[PDB]
C-alpha cells in the first residue's frame, strides 16, 4: 500500500527536499520519493546525492542542466535558461545556476566572522537616513515600493508584519512569516549563503502598512553594532 508518485508528483517532492536542505522551508514530504528516484533517475537520492546536486547547480556545475539539477527517459532535456523553478507545491523558489552568474555570488559563513561588538545607539533608525553599513535602502515613491539591499547577510534581518520578495543571485522567493529572513544555504566544503540580497517591500497594497525591520545596525576597522528597528509601512 505504497503510493506511486508520477513523474510530476515526485519532482515536486524532489524539489521539496531541496528547499528544506536549502533552509528555505522547514518541512518536507518525501513519501514515495525514494522509489520515484530509483525508477526515474536510476539512483538512490539520499542526502549525499542531494547535497551534491545542490553544490553542482549553484557552484561547481558547468554546462546545461536538467530539471533535477544534473549536468523514453525523462530529464534528458538539459536547460540553458539560467534558472530552475524549485517548486514543491507547498513553496517555491526561482533559483539560478552558478554557471549563469558572473563568478561566485556566495560567501563562506563557516569561516570565522569578524566579531562585532555592541555599542550604544538609537533603537529606531529612519528608512531615509540609514547609517548602518549592512543595509542600504532605496524608495521608489512612483511605484510605492521600498528595496532594502542587505550587504552583510550574516547579520540577521527580522521582519515583523511584512510580506516581501527576496531577490538574490542565488534564489528569488517570497516571505510572508515573521522572523529572520530565510536565505539559501549551500554546502560546499562549508556553509555558503548569498553575498548580498534585496528585500522588496510593496506598499501598493495595505498588508505592508505595518511592516517593520529589526536588525543590528553595524558601524565602523573595528566593527560595532546596536539593535535597531526600521519602520517601512
Amino acid at each position, epitope marked *: *500500500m505504497e*503510493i*506511486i508518485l*508520477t*513523474l510530476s508528483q515526485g519532482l515536486k517532492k524532489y524539489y521539496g527536499k531541496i528547499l528544506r536542505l536549502l533552509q528555505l522551508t522547514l518541512e518536507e514530504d518525501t513519501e514515495g520519493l525514494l522509489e520515484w528516484c*530509483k*525508477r526515474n533517475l536510476g539512483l538512490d537520492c539520499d542526502d549525499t546525492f542531494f547535497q551534491k546536486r545542490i553544490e553542482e547547480f549553484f557552484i561547481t556545475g558547468e554546462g546545461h542542466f536538467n530539471e533535477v539539477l544534473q549536468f*523514453a527517459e525523462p530529464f534528458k532535456s538539459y536547460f540553458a535558461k539560467g534558472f530552475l523553478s524549485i517548486d514543491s507545491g507547498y513553496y517555491s523558489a526561482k533559483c539560478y545556476s552558478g554557471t549563469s552568474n558572473s563568478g561566485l555570488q556566495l560567501i563562506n559563513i563557516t569561516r570565522h566572522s569578524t566579531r562585532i561588538v555592541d555599542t550604544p545607539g538609537p533603537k529606531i533608525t529612519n528608512l531615509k537616513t540609514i547609517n548602518c553599513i549592512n543595509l542600504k535602502a532605496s524608495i521608489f515613491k512612483e511605484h510605492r515600493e521600498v528595496e532594502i539591499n542587505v550587504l552583510l547577510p550574516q547579520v540577521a534581518v527580522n521582519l515583523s508584519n511584512c510580506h516581501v520578495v527576496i531577490k538574490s543571485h542565488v534564489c528569488d522567493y517570497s516571505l510572508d512569516i515573521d522572523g529572520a529572513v530565510r536565505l539559501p544555504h549551500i554546502y560546499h566544503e562549508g556553509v555558503f549563503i548569498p553575498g548580498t540580497y534585496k528585500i522588496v517591500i510593496d506598499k501598493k497594497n495595505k498588508l505592508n502598512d505595518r511592516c517593520t525591520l529589526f536588525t543590528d545596525c553595524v558601524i565602523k576597522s573595528v566593527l560595532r553594532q546596536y539593535k535597531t528597528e526600521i519602520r517601512i509601512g
Partner: antibody
Amino acid sequence: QVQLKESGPGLVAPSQSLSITCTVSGFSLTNYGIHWVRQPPGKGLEWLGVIWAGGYTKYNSALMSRLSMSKDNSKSQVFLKMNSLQTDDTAMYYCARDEVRRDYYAMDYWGQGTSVTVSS
Amino acid sequence: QIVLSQSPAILSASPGEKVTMTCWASSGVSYMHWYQQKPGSSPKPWIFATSNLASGVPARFSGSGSGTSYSLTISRVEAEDAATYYCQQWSFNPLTFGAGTKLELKR
C-alpha cells in the same frame, strides 16, 4: 518496431525454479523498464514486478520472497527467476515495456506470452 | 492491495448498441488503464490514464472516471469488439488488475 518475446520452459517441477527470458528489439533496455505480468488459466492478470531502465527492481509484495529479476543490456534481455514453485504458478507469463509520461506510467507494448505449467 | 471489481462480468450487446462497463476500486486511485484481450492473444493497451485512447483504438471507445469508480463505454458496439476488457490501477503498489468484463456480441 518495438518487439518483446518471452522464452521459457513449458514444464517445470514444483521442486525446481522457473527461469524465463524476455528478449526485446526496437528499443534499448537502458531507456525503458520491463514488467512481468502473468495470467493463470481462465483467470485474470497479476503483476509480478518490474526492472527499471537503471537496473533497480520492484516486486509484487505478495511474491517478493520467491521472485527476482535481472537484465543484460548488451543482450537486450530481461530475466525472471521464481523459486519455491507451486501448482498455482501455472500461468502464461508476459513481459511488457514500461512507459513514462508526466502524469502517468503505462505498459505500452506486450510480448505474446510464454506458457509455464508447474507439475511433477 | 487495491482490489478492482469489474461489473458486470459479462456484457451481452447487439451491434449498434451503446454499452458501459464499470471498474470499482476498493480505495480511490488517480487514473485507470484499460486493456483489450482476445482469446489466444496478449492484453492490448486500449485506454491510457482514464480517457486517452491507445493508437489504433476506434473512436467509438471512450473512458471516464475518478476516485473509486471508472468506466469504459462503447458508443455503438461492433462484432469485432467481442473480447475481455481489463482495468488496471497504477496509484499504489502492487499494480493490480480487475478480473475483466467479457463483452459478448448478440446476432
